[PDB]
């Protein structure tokens, strides 16, 4: 994973997102949905999604939420106010813990200001403090910035390792991007059947065909334009649509 | 070095109040995680209140809410006003400058006798 | 949960011998505490930084050893002049827990 103070950014971008595969897989200790409840994501389309990436301890995961103080959300990580993705959270203790301590995740403890969200700050200035120049040397009124969690494999729940992931859907003014999944049913014949073929909603009998559409044409009109033909999505076959009977 | 001196200690009854002023002889209270420790008499020592370089309070689990903690860079002085003491706190209070660890803390008192 | 440190108080020696202080630690910590110097009517001082890292400003007297739990002080050839007791701490995480104190008597 990434550390705490330099966490990573994935922008996911165009594609076909299952977070169902997500939201079931019960090996997550935390999953929290804010701006949107879990089980609609699956259904929505957003413009991009971000992912960021890190390791905390076990406790300080409640700091990554809108709205919250510490010396994780103040400067190293901090979610606007607004937020509307999701956090998810699991324990590692197995694979980021070593014994003899894994110095190796290092956390930012001192800072001037409290950051912006999603504001990233990799520098290594010595925090001055007494109003003494530090001159780039440590000692008295000057603190090194960035300290580690020493991870061992005995430690308490909450002191072990959580690595988080943080989904962040933005909407920001384009013409669309990637969106949930796409739950169909079978198709029936030789009955009259109300059906949707992604997007044509009608009503009918759907019988076997035997025109040949062009390998870029979905469903033929008639002369005076009403639906008569469609083609199948998934196995792209041509169906013929006939009313059923009225009299 | 630093020689933090604390002032504000005296005596006063329930519903009381108090503003206690970490006096940071020293420098740098701009930019420092400073806190509260309090110990009664014969007794071990207790956490109380902080504050971060960048202002956040968490205070501790019984006085929590009716207590304020407080900074000032300019005048470099450290504000700590209390009110509503149930005077179960008559204790010797200390002020010490969280450096990683600690260390450099004064000294002073105070009682909250309901007579 | 939080953690209760323990200690094994009261003290009784002579100068210039070796004794040890040990501090429980009733919950799996990691390995960042401190120990403190509190002399009778004064403000503590603190001489083990966050393992055995002694802080400056201390004589070579003291030899803090650390681990997961079970931490452990140690003076070696004591000196008339450490009247007071020792307490354990727990860094890092805000509300910290403190120990019980052990004071130590000087033989005469």
């Known amino acids: 994973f990434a550390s705490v103070y330099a966490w990573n950014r994935k922008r996911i971008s165009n594609c076909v997102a299952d977070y169902s595969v997500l939201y079931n897989s019960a090996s997550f200790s935390t999953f929290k949905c804010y701006g949107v409840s879990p089980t609609k994501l699956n259904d929505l389309c957003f413009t991009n999604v971000y992912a960021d990436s890190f390791v905390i301890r076990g406790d300080e995961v409640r700091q990554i939420a809108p709205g919250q103080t510490g010396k994780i959300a103040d400067y190293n990580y901090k979610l606007p106010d607004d937020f509307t993705g999701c956090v998810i959270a699991w324990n590692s203790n197995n694979l980021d813990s070593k014994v003899g301590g894994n110095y190796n995740y290092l956390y930012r403890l001192f800072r001037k200001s409290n950051l912006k969200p999603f504001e990233r700050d990799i520098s290594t200035e010595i925090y001055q403090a007494g109003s003494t120049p530090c001159n780039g040397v440590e000692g008295f009124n000057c603190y090194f910035p960035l300290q580690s969690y020493g991870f061992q494999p005995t430690n308490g729940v909450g002191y072990q390792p959580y690595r988080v992931v943080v989904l962040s859907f933005e909407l920001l003014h384009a013409p669309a991007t990637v969106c949930g999944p796409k739950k169909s049913t079978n198709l029936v014949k030789n009955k009259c059947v109300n059906f949707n073929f992604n997007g044509l909603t009608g009503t009918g009998v759907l019988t076997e065909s035997n025109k040949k559409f062009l390998p870029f044409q979905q469903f033929g009109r008639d002369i005076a334009d009403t639906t008569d033909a469609v083609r199948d999505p998934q196995t792209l076959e041509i169906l013929d649509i006939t009313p059923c009977s009225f009299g | 070095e630093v020689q933090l001196v604390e002032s504000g200690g005296g005596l006063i009854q329930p519903g009381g109040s108090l503003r206690l002023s970490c006096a940071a002889s020293?420098?740098?209270?701009?930019?420092?995680?400073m806190s509260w420790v309090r110990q009664a008499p014969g007794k071990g020592l207790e956490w109380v209140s902080v504050?971060?370089?960048?202002?956040?309070?968490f205070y501790a689990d019984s006085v929590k809410g009716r207590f304020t903690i407080s900074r000032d860079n300019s005048k470099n002085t450290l504000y700590l006003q209390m009110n509503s003491l149930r005077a179960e706190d008559t204790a010797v209070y200390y002020c010490?400058?969280?450096?990683?660890?600690?260390?450099?803390w004064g000294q002073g008192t105070l009682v909250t006798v309901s007579s | 949960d939080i953690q209760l440190t323990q200690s094994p108080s009261f003290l009784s020696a002579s100068v210039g011998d070796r004794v040890t202080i040990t501090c429980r630690a009733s919950?799996?910590?990691?390995?960042?505490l401190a120990w403190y110097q509190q002399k009778p009517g004064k403000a503590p001082k603190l001489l083990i930084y966050?393992?055995?890292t002694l802080q400056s400003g201390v004589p070579s007297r003291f030899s803090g050893s650390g681990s997961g739990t079970e931490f452990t002080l140690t003076i070696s050839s004591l000196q008339p002049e450490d009247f007071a007791t020792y307490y354990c701490?727990?860094?890092?995480?805000?509300?910290?827990?403190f120990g019980g104190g052990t004071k130590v008597e000087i033989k005469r």
């Open positions: 010490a400058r969280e450096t990683l660890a600690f260390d450099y």
């Open positions: 020293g420098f740098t209270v701009s930019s420092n995680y």
């Open positions: 504050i971060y370089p960048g202002g956040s309070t």
């Open positions: 919950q799996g910590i990691s390995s960042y």
């Open positions: 966050a393992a055995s």
């Open positions: 701490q727990q860094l890092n995480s805000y509300p910290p827990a």
